[PDB]
Design a binder for this molecule. Structure first.
Ligand SMILES: Nc1ncnc2c1ncn2[C@@H]1O[C@H](COP(=O)(O)OP(=O)(O)O)[C@@H](O)[C@H]1O
Length: 904
């Protein structure tokens, strides 16, 4: 692998990216005169750094993004936003030397992910064509690995990518640690779920500014046509909105070249104007036969099957290209000029394939031939799961509904019938996910959270379809059937125009939603949100609102929030890191029929607020985090008994003392509905837990979750818990962890372990620690023989030794836990050989999400590490790996990386 050869490779890539062929392309195809140049026609876009919650953190430039690069980096936006051109721009900048950020890269490869087949080498070789003859697939792979992060891959259109065709590139994106090259991946917002978990940086391509839009217009158009078109843009609002995306700008430019005056109100109508214009101009070239319509039908079917088969390139066998060729003559599709093994065709953009397919689908559904309608409904029947619908079929239905009203009837009638989620993969809004959100608190499982998100996205798709349908109130019957029992997500910082249409023309659907989730970021009063909610009178079953980082609150903010909260019969409220809520909890909530749940997190609360919280007796869920204000009479915990309907209580980091703990105990006696209790991180409450535990377990209970952690738990309280454990039968979750039992600790703990048989449904056990805890390990395992469904197990600071570690291993082999999701063994005494033995059984729990092996400073033998990486490969479901005190500095770290987050 001579360095000469590497330089010849780099020179070839640079030659390709610097050629007029790479620099210039026809956006709309070779048969329409518009030419885009990566250097000259390119206007700098605005980009946004993205937060897990899909909120925009920071504004960026391409240069700043390249400067800040972390891999994998994901660039997202709606179709036609300019992402592909962004990648081509990066490639061109690297060649030019024009960018300092890219100077670190020895090699940059740009490929369209759509044409990825075979393996990485074959794809690069076949696409780029400039790869030296004597560099071979193994030699090339070794070259990339050796070259490390000095290689930049620009991968375009993951939405156009079917990963089974090329698993190697899929791995290049998804497992980047094996490769250690840098990757930048392009995808739509719709399909972002597929790559979301993988990306270390996420940026969105923003809308196109009027200056930039007209810059593009002026470039590709003659001046008369430039001002004529611009007048048309400024006179119509819809066109102005359509001009925020560059592709549509190019398309209207093309329309303007053909047509003097045009009316398109929707992006579907833009495409329709263009298509109709194409037939009008180019119909005359077909001199061949008696059928034009048969050819158009062929095009529509080509696009339709294309979307469903995920095939955006069309290669018929050689000699059979006749219909495709006729379609090239008309200009509906383009054939690849570059030399291909066989003739290959495509639509100028994916969105045009989607439009042609939508026009075809609508034409089938609205057809006067029962057969065609049957085929169209058959196409609809291919859409089962919402996952496929929002991502794969989303644009298909946008143009389908956009084309005809009758078609929206069929589509909405179908979507209302859809019970299937599909893939829940990329939906997570948190990091390795109760207490984190209402969504975590109110939902029993993570899957439920993901499903909830999926429904939000499904509904947004539905509203998009609603706006494109352009039927104001006419379809309200069909639409309400769809939206009913579903949920809507609204970000006050980002409000789409179709939300206004939805609220305006369809108030019944907004009321038919089970709930609306409202998010406020840093501002209690965006004005656009105010406009959205106030303009028309809405009524909501439930409003779920989260107030984020609001440290400034005034009268306008409070009164306005009151008006917004009054829109719903039920209200669920989360206050996160809000320093502006002091006296204001009572005033903000002044008009509420029902407040269902309240979450206050890392926010200061005065005695007035505490009093108001206990004042509302209808509260079924209460979670407060970090109250450092001392408790007085009339306080939060003094009268906790006021809320008798509370089914979930979470108290975290509460300033309390022994008497406060006793008052809390007396209060817990009065809550008969509690199925969830978390008392966590309570310090200085002396013996308060003896009192607290008694009140909980004294009587027969509905309690299904108890987390007592870092609160001061006494061995007496654990003994009481053991004695009264028969009173809480339904408990599936017991976390007593992070507690030391001082005296009679092992006796009390064994006493508890002995009474574990009482709990039939117990899926989670987290144990406290004491002197000689490990001696209780055999006893615990016998109890666990009758607990095959244990999801979470931990013994923290039990100091397990090799005898205990093999004991647990043998237990695991004989009595396997096949559902065990996470294992916490912390502060253990395990030899490197000891862990090495354990890796054998450790390999076979595949449902393991999280494991903590942390300990006192410990150097794993390398032989242990080899197996560490290998077992980590065998476990696909790892979300979190926590190894603390393990020494990996120079040597073993490179192989230990994974999709999961690792803590060292
Ligand atoms: N920075 C830019 N300035 C001006 N026009 C642009 C810019 N980026 C893209 N365009 C135009 O928008 C069209 C669509 O770009 P493309 O990247 O294919 O869409 P997508 O982002 O969906 O892949 C291009 O043909 C180009 O003419």
């Amino acid at each position: 692998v001579t360095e000469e050869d590497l330089n010849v490779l780099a020179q070839n890539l640079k030659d390709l990216y610097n050629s007029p062929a790479f620099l210039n392309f026809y956006p709309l195809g070779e048969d329409i005169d518009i030419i885009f140049n990566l250097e000259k026609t390119f206007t700098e876009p605005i980009m946004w750094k993205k937060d897990h919650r899909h909120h925009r953190v920071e504004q960026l430039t391409l240069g700043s993004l390249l400067e800040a690069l972390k891999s994998p980096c994901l660039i997202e936006g709606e179709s036609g936003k300019g992402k592909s051109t962004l990648l081509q721009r990066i490639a061109m900048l690297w060649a030019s030397g024009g960018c300092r950020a890219l100077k670190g890269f020895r090699l940059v490869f740009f490929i369209h992910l759509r044409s990825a087949r075979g393996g990485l080498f074959e794809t690069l070789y076949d696409q780029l064509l400039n790869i030296p003859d004597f560099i071979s697939k193994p030699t090339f792979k070794a070259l990339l690995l050796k070259l490390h992060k000095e290689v930049l891959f620009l991968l375009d259109g993951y939405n156009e990518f079917h990963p089974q065709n090329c698993p190697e590139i899929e791995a290049l994106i998804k497992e980047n640690h094996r490769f250690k090259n840098m990757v930048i991946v392009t995808t739509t917002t719709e399909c972002l779920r597929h790559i979301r978990h993988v990306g270390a940086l996420t940026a969105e391509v923003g809308d196109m500014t009027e200056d930039s839009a007209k810059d593009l217009i002026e470039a590709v158009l003659v001046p008369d046509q430039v001002e004529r078109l611009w007048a048309q843009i400024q006179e119509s609002r819809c066109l102005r909105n359509l001009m925020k995306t560059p592709l549509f700008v190019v398309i209207t430019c093309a329309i303007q070249m053909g047509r003097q005056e045009f009316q398109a109100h929707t992006q579907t109508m833009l495409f329709q104007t263009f298509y109709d214009l194409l037939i009008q101009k180019n119909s005359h070239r077909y001199r061949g036969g008696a059928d034009f319509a048969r050819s158009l039908d062929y095009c529509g079917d080509l696009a339709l099957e294309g979307v469903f088969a995920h095939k955006f390139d069309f290669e018929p066998e050689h000699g059979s290209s006749m219909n495709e060729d006729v379609l090239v003559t008309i200009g509906l599709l383009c054939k690849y000029t570059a030399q291909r093994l066989k003739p290959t065709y495509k639509f100028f953009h994916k969105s045009f394939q989607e439009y042609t397919a939508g026009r075809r689908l609508s034409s089938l559904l609205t057809s006067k031939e029962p057969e065609e309608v049957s085929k169209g409904n058959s196409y609809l029947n291919k859409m089962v799961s919402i996952s496929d619908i929002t991502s794969l079929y989303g644009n298909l239905l946008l143009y389908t509904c956009g084309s005809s009203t009758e078609a929206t009837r069929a589509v909405m009638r179908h979507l209302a019938m859809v019970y299937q989620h599909g893939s829940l993969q990329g939906l997570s809004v948190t990091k390795r996910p109760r207490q984190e959100s209402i969504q975590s608190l109110r939902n029993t499982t993570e899957q439920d959270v993901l499903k909830a998100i999926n429904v939000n996205s499904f509904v947004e798709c539905g509203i998009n379809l609603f706006s494109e349908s352009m039927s104001k109130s006419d379809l309200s019957q069909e639409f309400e059937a769809f939206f009913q029992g579903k949920s809507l997500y609204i970000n006050s910082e980002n409000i789409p125009d179709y939300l206004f249409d939805f609220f305006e023309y369809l108030p019944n659907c907004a009321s038919a939603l089970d709930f609306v989730k409202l998010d406020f970021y840093e501002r209690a009063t965006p004005p656009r949100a105010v406009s959205l909610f106030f303009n028309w009178k809405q009524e909501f079953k439930t409003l779920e609102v989260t107030l984020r980082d609001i440290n400034k609150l005034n009268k306008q903010d409070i009164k306005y929030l009151g008006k917004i909260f009054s829109s719903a019969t039920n209200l669920r409220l989360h206050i996160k890191r809000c320093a502006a809520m002091a006296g204001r909890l009572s005033s903000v909530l002044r008009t509420c029929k029902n407040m269902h749940t309240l979450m206050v997190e890392a926010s200061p609360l005065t005695t007035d607020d505490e009093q108001y919280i206990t004042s509302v007796t209808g509260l079924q869920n209460l979670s407060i985090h970090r109250l450092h204000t001392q408790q007085l009479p009339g306080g939060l915990i003094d009268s906790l008994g006021n809320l008798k309907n509370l089914e979930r209580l979470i108290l975290d980091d509460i300033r309390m003392n022994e008497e406060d703990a006793k008052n809390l105990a007396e209060g817990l006696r009065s809550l008969k509905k509690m199925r969830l209790l978390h008392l966590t991180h309570l310090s200085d409450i002396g013996e308060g837990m003896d009192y607290i535990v008694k009140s909980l377990s004294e009587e027969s209970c509905d309690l299904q979750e108890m987390k007592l952690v870092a609160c001061c738990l006494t061995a007496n309280s654990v003994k009481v818990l053991a004695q009264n454990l028969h009173n809480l039968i339904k408990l599936s979750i017991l976390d007593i962890s992070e507690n030391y039992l001082e005296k009679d600790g092992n006796e009390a703990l064994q006493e508890l372990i002995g009474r574990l048989g009482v709990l039939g449904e117990l899926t989670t056990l987290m144990l406290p620690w004491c002197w000689d805890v490990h001696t209780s390990l055999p006893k615990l395992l016998k109890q666990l023989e009758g607990t095959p469904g244990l999801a979470k197990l931990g013994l923290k600071n039990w100091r397990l030794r090799d005898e205990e570690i093999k004991s647990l291993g043998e237990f695991l082999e004989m009595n396997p836990l096949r559902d065990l999701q996470q294992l916490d063994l912390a502060g253990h005494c395990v030899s490197s050989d000891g862990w090495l033995y354990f890796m054998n059984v450790f390999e076979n729990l595949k449902q393991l999400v999280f494991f903590d092996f942390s300990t006192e400073e410990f150097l794993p033998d390398a032989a242990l590490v080899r197996k560490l990486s290998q077992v980590l490969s065998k476990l696909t479901l790892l979300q979190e790996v926590k190894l603390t005190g393990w020494e990996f500095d120079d040597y073993d770290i490179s192989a230990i990386k994974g999709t999961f987050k690792l803590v060292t």
